[PDB]
Amino acid sequence: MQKRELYEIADGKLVRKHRFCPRCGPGVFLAEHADRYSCGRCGYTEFKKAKKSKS
Ligand SMILES: [Zn+2]
């Protein structure tokens, strides 16, 4: 049969930009790079997680 149902979504893009480093936050921002984050202080590094949305 094969049903072609590519239906989009309207999701409230909730992304609190300027995500600090939990414990270093007040005084040490989380180095936000285009591809990831890093913390020259406690070595806390995190990647810009690709938002795998169906649409
Ligand atoms: Zn840190």
Q: What is the 3-state secondary structure (H, E, C) of the chain?
A: CCCCCCCCCCCCCCCCCCCCCCCCCCCCCCEECCCEEECCCCCCCEECCCCCCCC
Residue 55's contacts (CB-CB under 8 Å, 6 or more residues apart) are: 7, 8, 9
Instruction: List the determination method.
Output: NMR
Distance (angstroms) between ligand 1 centre and the Cα of 14 equals 23
CA 23 to chain centre: 18
Cite the annotated binding site for Zn(2+) by residue number: 21, 24, 39, 42
User: Using CB atoms within 10 A of its CB, is residue 21 exposed (0-12), middle (13-18) or buried (19+)?
Assistant: buried
Domain of 52?
21-55
Specify the CATH number for the domain of residue 44: 6.20.50.180
- The rounded distance, in Å, linking the Cα atoms of 28 and 48 is 19
- The rounded distance, in Å, linking the Cα atoms of 54 and 27 is 38
Residues near ion ligand 1 (Cβ under 5 Å)? 21, 24, 39, 41-42, 44
